[PDB]
Amino acid sequence: DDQALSTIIQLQDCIQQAIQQLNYSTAEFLAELLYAECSILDKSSVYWSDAVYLYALSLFLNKSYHTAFQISKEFKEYHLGIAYIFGRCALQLSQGVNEAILTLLSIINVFSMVLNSNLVHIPD
Amino acid sequence: ALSTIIQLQDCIQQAIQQLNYSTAEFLAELLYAECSILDKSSVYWSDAVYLYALSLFLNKSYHTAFQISKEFKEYHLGIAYIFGRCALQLSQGVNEAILTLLSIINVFSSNLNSNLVHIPD
């Protein structure tokens, strides 16, 4: 447990590093492994939501828009970035726009769960 | 009038950092047009060309950024990187990318510091 948190932080840092350059397949593999590792952690942990959001962003980035769209629909409410990924997938695919609206309206009205984070591509 | 171009290039940095595409399309076009006239060898010229090529690359516009980076690949390392990856995507102009990047690596080998976004190490 003492090193368990360090590994997750290191994997997250590597994922932001990889996505910072135009290196996506490695970002895919690191996001996949972090998402698999975070399975044991409870859903209440911010780490699970962060890993799911990173995985969704990656799966969006490599044109695998369908898979990103499901992996965003399962936990769309938990994180703001997941909702962003869901909305992007919906606009590209014209599938399930309505729940995207129902989530985005709530998230914007409340702003003006997890809402703010230091990760990359966190929407403003 | 360099404050305005510095501000708009920072805006381009922020926009691309926000995963918005076709947003820095116009802004990079504007920087290219504005800075093509003031100089052809200044650091701002290479910076504008690199940002323009990166914006063109990211927006499924490869047959333009290809030649755009081809013209000025020898000036900035990021331009050469964009040129090489576009060569890979389009399967064209590959030998030129090989020579330019070999020259770049040899510079590191022999006894460049721009910190712009998406610049590979």
PDB file of C-alpha atoms in Angstrom:
ATOM      1  CA  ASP A   1       0.000   0.000   0.000  1.00  0.00           C
ATOM      2  CA  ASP A   2       2.939   2.303   0.694  1.00  0.00           C
ATOM      3  CA  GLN A   3       4.188   1.882  -2.884  1.00  0.00           C
ATOM      4  CA  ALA A   4       0.744   1.249  -4.401  1.00  0.00           C
ATOM      5  CA  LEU A   5      -0.064   4.966  -4.494  1.00  0.00           C
ATOM      6  CA  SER A   6       3.377   5.798  -5.909  1.00  0.00           C
ATOM      7  CA  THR A   7       2.860   3.454  -8.866  1.00  0.00           C
ATOM      8  CA  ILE A   8      -0.491   5.055  -9.734  1.00  0.00           C
ATOM      9  CA  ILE A   9       0.969   8.569  -9.580  1.00  0.00           C
ATOM     10  CA  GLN A  10       3.935   7.502 -11.710  1.00  0.00           C
ATOM     11  CA  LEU A  11       1.636   5.904 -14.293  1.00  0.00           C
ATOM     12  CA  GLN A  12      -0.495   9.056 -14.419  1.00  0.00           C
ATOM     13  CA  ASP A  13       2.599  11.219 -14.885  1.00  0.00           C
ATOM     14  CA  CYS A  14       3.799   8.943 -17.682  1.00  0.00           C
ATOM     15  CA  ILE A  15       0.377   9.190 -19.335  1.00  0.00           C
ATOM     16  CA  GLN A  16       0.403  12.997 -19.307  1.00  0.00           C
ATOM     17  CA  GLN A  17       3.996  12.909 -20.559  1.00  0.00           C
ATOM     18  CA  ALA A  18       3.087  10.597 -23.449  1.00  0.00           C
ATOM     19  CA  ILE A  19       0.003  12.571 -24.458  1.00  0.00           C
ATOM     20  CA  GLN A  20       2.006  15.815 -24.318  1.00  0.00           C
ATOM     21  CA  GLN A  21       3.966  14.677 -27.342  1.00  0.00           C
ATOM     22  CA  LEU A  22       2.234  13.261 -30.402  1.00  0.00           C
ATOM     23  CA  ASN A  23       2.724   9.735 -29.040  1.00  0.00           C
ATOM     24  CA  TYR A  24      -0.645   8.021 -28.826  1.00  0.00           C
ATOM     25  CA  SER A  25      -0.214   4.234 -28.970  1.00  0.00           C
ATOM     26  CA  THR A  26       2.028   4.338 -25.898  1.00  0.00           C
ATOM     27  CA  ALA A  27      -0.575   6.599 -24.314  1.00  0.00           C
ATOM     28  CA  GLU A  28      -3.103   3.903 -25.235  1.00  0.00           C
ATOM     29  CA  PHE A  29      -1.119   1.141 -23.542  1.00  0.00           C
ATOM     30  CA  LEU A  30      -0.401   3.167 -20.400  1.00  0.00           C
ATOM     31  CA  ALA A  31      -4.030   4.290 -20.101  1.00  0.00           C
ATOM     32  CA  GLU A  32      -5.165   0.682 -20.549  1.00  0.00           C
ATOM     33  CA  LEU A  33      -2.811  -0.622 -17.868  1.00  0.00           C
ATOM     34  CA  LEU A  34      -3.687   2.150 -15.413  1.00  0.00           C
ATOM     35  CA  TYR A  35      -7.404   1.556 -15.984  1.00  0.00           C
ATOM     36  CA  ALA A  36      -6.938  -2.173 -15.385  1.00  0.00           C
ATOM     37  CA  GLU A  37      -4.861  -1.565 -12.245  1.00  0.00           C
ATOM     38  CA  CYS A  38      -7.396   0.878 -10.781  1.00  0.00           C
ATOM     39  CA  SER A  39     -10.108  -1.813 -10.891  1.00  0.00           C
ATOM     40  CA  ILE A  40      -9.344  -2.975  -7.344  1.00  0.00           C
ATOM     41  CA  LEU A  41      -9.769   0.553  -5.985  1.00  0.00           C
ATOM     42  CA  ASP A  42     -13.288   1.544  -5.003  1.00  0.00           C
ATOM     43  CA  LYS A  43     -15.380   3.820  -7.199  1.00  0.00           C
ATOM     44  CA  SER A  44     -15.332   6.530  -4.513  1.00  0.00           C
ATOM     45  CA  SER A  45     -11.583   6.954  -5.039  1.00  0.00           C
ATOM     46  CA  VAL A  46     -10.623   9.913  -7.211  1.00  0.00           C
ATOM     47  CA  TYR A  47      -7.938   7.702  -8.764  1.00  0.00           C
ATOM     48  CA  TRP A  48     -10.556   5.494 -10.435  1.00  0.00           C
ATOM     49  CA  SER A  49     -12.339   8.471 -11.985  1.00  0.00           C
ATOM     50  CA  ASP A  50      -9.017   9.970 -13.083  1.00  0.00           C
ATOM     51  CA  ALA A  51      -7.900   6.722 -14.726  1.00  0.00           C
ATOM     52  CA  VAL A  52     -11.270   6.295 -16.446  1.00  0.00           C
ATOM     53  CA  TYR A  53     -11.078   9.865 -17.762  1.00  0.00           C
ATOM     54  CA  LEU A  54      -7.517   9.381 -19.022  1.00  0.00           C
ATOM     55  CA  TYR A  55      -8.530   6.122 -20.702  1.00  0.00           C
ATOM     56  CA  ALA A  56     -11.534   7.826 -22.305  1.00  0.00           C
ATOM     57  CA  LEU A  57      -9.404  10.706 -23.576  1.00  0.00           C
ATOM     58  CA  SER A  58      -6.869   8.293 -25.046  1.00  0.00           C
ATOM     59  CA  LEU A  59      -9.480   6.036 -26.655  1.00  0.00           C
ATOM     60  CA  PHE A  60     -10.931   9.173 -28.199  1.00  0.00           C
ATOM     61  CA  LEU A  61      -7.547  10.399 -29.410  1.00  0.00           C
ATOM     62  CA  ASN A  62      -6.798   7.328 -31.557  1.00  0.00           C
ATOM     63  CA  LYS A  63     -10.052   7.591 -33.599  1.00  0.00           C
ATOM     64  CA  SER A  64     -11.524   4.567 -31.734  1.00  0.00           C
ATOM     65  CA  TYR A  65     -14.503   6.789 -31.091  1.00  0.00           C
ATOM     66  CA  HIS A  66     -17.056   4.053 -30.352  1.00  0.00           C
ATOM     67  CA  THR A  67     -15.061   2.473 -27.538  1.00  0.00           C
ATOM     68  CA  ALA A  68     -14.363   5.882 -26.033  1.00  0.00           C
ATOM     69  CA  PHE A  69     -18.098   6.557 -26.269  1.00  0.00           C
ATOM     70  CA  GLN A  70     -19.092   3.502 -24.207  1.00  0.00           C
ATOM     71  CA  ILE A  71     -16.252   3.840 -21.692  1.00  0.00           C
ATOM     72  CA  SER A  72     -17.470   7.396 -21.214  1.00  0.00           C
ATOM     73  CA  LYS A  73     -21.157   6.466 -20.960  1.00  0.00           C
ATOM     74  CA  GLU A  74     -20.606   4.062 -18.071  1.00  0.00           C
ATOM     75  CA  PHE A  75     -19.178   6.744 -15.748  1.00  0.00           C
ATOM     76  CA  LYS A  76     -20.252   9.978 -17.426  1.00  0.00           C
ATOM     77  CA  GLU A  77     -21.568  11.539 -14.204  1.00  0.00           C
ATOM     78  CA  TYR A  78     -18.470  10.955 -12.078  1.00  0.00           C
ATOM     79  CA  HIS A  79     -16.048  13.361 -13.751  1.00  0.00           C
ATOM     80  CA  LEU A  80     -16.251  16.484 -15.886  1.00  0.00           C
ATOM     81  CA  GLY A  81     -13.650  15.273 -18.378  1.00  0.00           C
ATOM     82  CA  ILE A  82     -15.591  12.051 -18.898  1.00  0.00           C
ATOM     83  CA  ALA A  83     -18.633  14.170 -19.749  1.00  0.00           C
ATOM     84  CA  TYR A  84     -16.496  16.156 -22.199  1.00  0.00           C
ATOM     85  CA  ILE A  85     -15.329  12.931 -23.844  1.00  0.00           C
ATOM     86  CA  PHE A  86     -18.930  11.716 -24.014  1.00  0.00           C
ATOM     87  CA  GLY A  87     -20.097  14.926 -25.660  1.00  0.00           C
ATOM     88  CA  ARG A  88     -17.308  14.779 -28.227  1.00  0.00           C
ATOM     89  CA  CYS A  89     -18.150  11.154 -29.023  1.00  0.00           C
ATOM     90  CA  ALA A  90     -21.847  12.002 -29.312  1.00  0.00           C
ATOM     91  CA  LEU A  91     -21.239  14.928 -31.663  1.00  0.00           C
ATOM     92  CA  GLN A  92     -19.063  12.792 -33.919  1.00  0.00           C
ATOM     93  CA  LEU A  93     -21.430   9.811 -33.877  1.00  0.00           C
ATOM     94  CA  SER A  94     -24.886  11.439 -33.505  1.00  0.00           C
ATOM     95  CA  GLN A  95     -25.689   8.710 -30.969  1.00  0.00           C
ATOM     96  CA  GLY A  96     -27.139   9.467 -27.540  1.00  0.00           C
ATOM     97  CA  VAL A  97     -26.990  13.252 -27.783  1.00  0.00           C
ATOM     98  CA  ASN A  98     -29.865  13.590 -25.316  1.00  0.00           C
ATOM     99  CA  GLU A  99     -28.173  12.163 -22.230  1.00  0.00           C
ATOM    100  CA  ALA A 100     -25.110  14.195 -23.197  1.00  0.00           C
ATOM    101  CA  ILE A 101     -27.349  17.269 -22.984  1.00  0.00           C
ATOM    102  CA  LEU A 102     -28.841  16.108 -19.687  1.00  0.00           C
ATOM    103  CA  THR A 103     -25.347  15.738 -18.219  1.00  0.00           C
ATOM    104  CA  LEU A 104     -23.781  18.873 -19.719  1.00  0.00           C
ATOM    105  CA  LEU A 105     -26.646  21.162 -18.694  1.00  0.00           C
ATOM    106  CA  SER A 106     -26.409  19.907 -15.114  1.00  0.00           C
ATOM    107  CA  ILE A 107     -22.619  20.201 -15.010  1.00  0.00           C
ATOM    108  CA  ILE A 108     -22.607  23.752 -16.386  1.00  0.00           C
ATOM    109  CA  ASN A 109     -25.523  24.981 -14.261  1.00  0.00           C
ATOM    110  CA  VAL A 110     -24.006  23.566 -11.067  1.00  0.00           C
ATOM    111  CA  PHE A 111     -20.592  25.041 -11.890  1.00  0.00           C
ATOM    112  CA  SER A 112     -22.088  28.476 -12.581  1.00  0.00           C
ATOM    113  CA  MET A 113     -18.637  14.413  -7.486  1.00  0.00           C
ATOM    114  CA  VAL A 114     -15.376  15.594  -9.076  1.00  0.00           C
ATOM    115  CA  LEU A 115     -15.321  18.814 -11.103  1.00  0.00           C
ATOM    116  CA  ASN A 116     -11.809  20.314 -11.052  1.00  0.00           C
ATOM    117  CA  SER A 117      -8.576  18.430 -11.706  1.00  0.00           C
ATOM    118  CA  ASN A 118      -4.994  19.126 -12.760  1.00  0.00           C
ATOM    119  CA  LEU A 119      -4.938  16.588 -15.607  1.00  0.00           C
ATOM    120  CA  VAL A 120      -4.406  17.469 -19.262  1.00  0.00           C
ATOM    121  CA  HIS A 121      -7.311  18.572 -21.487  1.00  0.00           C
ATOM    122  CA  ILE A 122      -9.533  19.318 -18.485  1.00  0.00           C
ATOM    123  CA  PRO A 123     -12.261  21.521 -19.991  1.00  0.00           C
ATOM    124  CA  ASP A 124     -12.901  25.106 -19.015  1.00  0.00           C
TER     125      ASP A 124
ATOM    126  CA  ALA B   1       4.194  45.175 -32.724  1.00  0.00           C
ATOM    127  CA  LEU B   2       5.509  41.959 -31.175  1.00  0.00           C
ATOM    128  CA  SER B   3       3.301  41.914 -28.069  1.00  0.00           C
ATOM    129  CA  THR B   4       0.216  41.108 -30.152  1.00  0.00           C
ATOM    130  CA  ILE B   5       1.864  38.188 -31.965  1.00  0.00           C
ATOM    131  CA  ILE B   6       3.296  36.855 -28.690  1.00  0.00           C
ATOM    132  CA  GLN B   7      -0.167  37.051 -27.126  1.00  0.00           C
ATOM    133  CA  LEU B   8      -1.863  35.298 -30.031  1.00  0.00           C
ATOM    134  CA  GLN B   9       0.771  32.548 -30.127  1.00  0.00           C
ATOM    135  CA  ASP B  10       0.174  32.015 -26.406  1.00  0.00           C
ATOM    136  CA  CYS B  11      -3.541  31.857 -27.211  1.00  0.00           C
ATOM    137  CA  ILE B  12      -2.741  29.194 -29.820  1.00  0.00           C
ATOM    138  CA  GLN B  13      -0.789  27.272 -27.178  1.00  0.00           C
ATOM    139  CA  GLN B  14      -3.747  27.451 -24.795  1.00  0.00           C
ATOM    140  CA  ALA B  15      -6.236  26.465 -27.502  1.00  0.00           C
ATOM    141  CA  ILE B  16      -4.330  23.399 -28.693  1.00  0.00           C
ATOM    142  CA  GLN B  17      -3.717  22.502 -25.049  1.00  0.00           C
ATOM    143  CA  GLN B  18      -7.531  22.454 -24.724  1.00  0.00           C
ATOM    144  CA  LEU B  19      -7.975  19.774 -27.436  1.00  0.00           C
ATOM    145  CA  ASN B  20      -9.843  22.202 -29.697  1.00  0.00           C
ATOM    146  CA  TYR B  21      -9.085  21.581 -33.368  1.00  0.00           C
ATOM    147  CA  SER B  22      -9.768  23.993 -36.241  1.00  0.00           C
ATOM    148  CA  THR B  23      -9.500  26.656 -33.498  1.00  0.00           C
ATOM    149  CA  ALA B  24      -5.794  27.339 -33.971  1.00  0.00           C
ATOM    150  CA  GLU B  25      -6.335  26.760 -37.696  1.00  0.00           C
ATOM    151  CA  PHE B  26      -7.365  30.397 -38.167  1.00  0.00           C
ATOM    152  CA  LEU B  27      -4.959  31.698 -35.528  1.00  0.00           C
ATOM    153  CA  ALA B  28      -1.960  29.852 -36.997  1.00  0.00           C
ATOM    154  CA  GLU B  29      -2.980  31.061 -40.458  1.00  0.00           C
ATOM    155  CA  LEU B  30      -3.028  34.591 -39.033  1.00  0.00           C
ATOM    156  CA  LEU B  31       0.406  34.236 -37.446  1.00  0.00           C
ATOM    157  CA  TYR B  32       1.836  32.818 -40.672  1.00  0.00           C
ATOM    158  CA  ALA B  33       0.395  35.678 -42.726  1.00  0.00           C
ATOM    159  CA  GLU B  34       1.470  38.351 -40.232  1.00  0.00           C
ATOM    160  CA  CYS B  35       5.023  37.100 -39.711  1.00  0.00           C
ATOM    161  CA  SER B  36       5.803  36.106 -43.308  1.00  0.00           C
ATOM    162  CA  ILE B  37       6.254  39.816 -44.068  1.00  0.00           C
ATOM    163  CA  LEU B  38       8.313  41.060 -41.111  1.00  0.00           C
ATOM    164  CA  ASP B  39      11.145  38.556 -41.587  1.00  0.00           C
ATOM    165  CA  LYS B  40      12.098  35.256 -43.195  1.00  0.00           C
ATOM    166  CA  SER B  41      14.882  34.196 -40.804  1.00  0.00           C
ATOM    167  CA  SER B  42      13.833  35.533 -37.387  1.00  0.00           C
ATOM    168  CA  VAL B  43      12.988  33.210 -34.508  1.00  0.00           C
ATOM    169  CA  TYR B  44       9.375  34.380 -34.675  1.00  0.00           C
ATOM    170  CA  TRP B  45       9.237  33.322 -38.329  1.00  0.00           C
ATOM    171  CA  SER B  46      10.304  29.760 -37.524  1.00  0.00           C
ATOM    172  CA  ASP B  47       7.964  29.709 -34.517  1.00  0.00           C
ATOM    173  CA  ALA B  48       4.997  30.805 -36.630  1.00  0.00           C
ATOM    174  CA  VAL B  49       5.866  28.267 -39.330  1.00  0.00           C
ATOM    175  CA  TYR B  50       6.114  25.470 -36.752  1.00  0.00           C
ATOM    176  CA  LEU B  51       2.805  26.405 -35.129  1.00  0.00           C
ATOM    177  CA  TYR B  52       1.169  26.632 -38.557  1.00  0.00           C
ATOM    178  CA  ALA B  53       2.501  23.229 -39.608  1.00  0.00           C
ATOM    179  CA  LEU B  54       1.407  21.661 -36.317  1.00  0.00           C
ATOM    180  CA  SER B  55      -2.091  23.134 -36.657  1.00  0.00           C
ATOM    181  CA  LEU B  56      -2.357  21.928 -40.257  1.00  0.00           C
ATOM    182  CA  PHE B  57      -1.109  18.474 -39.248  1.00  0.00           C
ATOM    183  CA  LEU B  58      -3.565  18.063 -36.377  1.00  0.00           C
ATOM    184  CA  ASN B  59      -6.656  18.936 -38.454  1.00  0.00           C
ATOM    185  CA  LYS B  60      -6.506  16.176 -41.100  1.00  0.00           C
ATOM    186  CA  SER B  61      -4.741  18.571 -43.505  1.00  0.00           C
ATOM    187  CA  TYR B  62      -1.591  16.708 -44.517  1.00  0.00           C
ATOM    188  CA  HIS B  63      -1.013  17.545 -48.191  1.00  0.00           C
ATOM    189  CA  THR B  64      -0.549  21.208 -47.197  1.00  0.00           C
ATOM    190  CA  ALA B  65       1.528  20.857 -44.024  1.00  0.00           C
ATOM    191  CA  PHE B  66       3.716  18.374 -45.923  1.00  0.00           C
ATOM    192  CA  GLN B  67       5.063  20.966 -48.350  1.00  0.00           C
ATOM    193  CA  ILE B  68       4.828  23.741 -45.735  1.00  0.00           C
ATOM    194  CA  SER B  69       7.252  21.889 -43.470  1.00  0.00           C
ATOM    195  CA  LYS B  70       9.258  20.737 -46.498  1.00  0.00           C
ATOM    196  CA  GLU B  71      10.108  24.332 -47.403  1.00  0.00           C
ATOM    197  CA  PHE B  72      11.480  25.214 -43.949  1.00  0.00           C
ATOM    198  CA  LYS B  73      12.322  21.855 -42.379  1.00  0.00           C
ATOM    199  CA  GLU B  74      15.971  22.837 -41.869  1.00  0.00           C
ATOM    200  CA  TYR B  75      15.171  25.889 -39.721  1.00  0.00           C
ATOM    201  CA  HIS B  76      13.472  24.370 -36.661  1.00  0.00           C
ATOM    202  CA  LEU B  77      13.485  20.861 -35.221  1.00  0.00           C
ATOM    203  CA  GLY B  78       9.725  20.861 -34.666  1.00  0.00           C
ATOM    204  CA  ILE B  79       9.167  21.662 -38.335  1.00  0.00           C
ATOM    205  CA  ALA B  80      11.323  18.673 -39.266  1.00  0.00           C
ATOM    206  CA  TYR B  81       9.401  16.460 -36.828  1.00  0.00           C
ATOM    207  CA  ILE B  82       6.084  17.523 -38.346  1.00  0.00           C
ATOM    208  CA  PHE B  83       7.503  16.979 -41.832  1.00  0.00           C
ATOM    209  CA  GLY B  84       8.690  13.483 -40.959  1.00  0.00           C
ATOM    210  CA  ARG B  85       5.442  12.379 -39.346  1.00  0.00           C
ATOM    211  CA  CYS B  86       3.478  13.785 -42.290  1.00  0.00           C
ATOM    212  CA  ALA B  87       5.832  11.905 -44.608  1.00  0.00           C
ATOM    213  CA  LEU B  88       4.993   8.754 -42.662  1.00  0.00           C
ATOM    214  CA  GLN B  89       1.257   9.417 -42.921  1.00  0.00           C
ATOM    215  CA  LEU B  90       1.366  10.290 -46.634  1.00  0.00           C
ATOM    216  CA  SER B  91       4.201   7.902 -47.639  1.00  0.00           C
ATOM    217  CA  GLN B  92       5.972  10.713 -49.509  1.00  0.00           C
ATOM    218  CA  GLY B  93       9.077  12.874 -49.159  1.00  0.00           C
ATOM    219  CA  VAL B  94      10.607  10.294 -46.848  1.00  0.00           C
ATOM    220  CA  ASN B  95      14.282  10.501 -47.850  1.00  0.00           C
ATOM    221  CA  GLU B  96      14.359  14.247 -47.187  1.00  0.00           C
ATOM    222  CA  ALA B  97      12.977  13.682 -43.690  1.00  0.00           C
ATOM    223  CA  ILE B  98      15.608  10.990 -43.133  1.00  0.00           C
ATOM    224  CA  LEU B  99      18.453  13.315 -44.116  1.00  0.00           C
ATOM    225  CA  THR B 100      17.135  16.278 -42.120  1.00  0.00           C
ATOM    226  CA  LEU B 101      16.609  14.229 -38.974  1.00  0.00           C
ATOM    227  CA  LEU B 102      19.994  12.523 -39.328  1.00  0.00           C
ATOM    228  CA  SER B 103      21.511  15.999 -39.506  1.00  0.00           C
ATOM    229  CA  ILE B 104      19.553  16.978 -36.390  1.00  0.00           C
ATOM    230  CA  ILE B 105      20.720  13.907 -34.458  1.00  0.00           C
ATOM    231  CA  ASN B 106      24.314  14.497 -35.547  1.00  0.00           C
ATOM    232  CA  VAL B 107      24.098  18.017 -34.094  1.00  0.00           C
ATOM    233  CA  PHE B 108      23.286  16.461 -30.724  1.00  0.00           C
ATOM    234  CA  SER B 109      26.045  13.908 -31.322  1.00  0.00           C
ATOM    235  CA  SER B 110      28.557  16.584 -32.344  1.00  0.00           C
ATOM    236  CA  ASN B 111      30.070  18.831 -29.681  1.00  0.00           C
ATOM    237  CA  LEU B 112      16.863  23.889 -30.549  1.00  0.00           C
ATOM    238  CA  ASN B 113      15.889  24.879 -27.004  1.00  0.00           C
ATOM    239  CA  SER B 114      12.388  26.117 -27.860  1.00  0.00           C
ATOM    240  CA  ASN B 115       9.885  25.006 -25.215  1.00  0.00           C
ATOM    241  CA  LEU B 116       6.761  25.206 -27.372  1.00  0.00           C
ATOM    242  CA  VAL B 117       3.910  22.762 -26.853  1.00  0.00           C
ATOM    243  CA  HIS B 118       4.090  19.249 -28.338  1.00  0.00           C
ATOM    244  CA  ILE B 119       7.817  19.662 -29.033  1.00  0.00           C
ATOM    245  CA  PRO B 120       9.398  16.192 -28.833  1.00  0.00           C
ATOM    246  CA  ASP B 121      12.467  15.697 -26.676  1.00  0.00           C
TER     247      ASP B 121
END
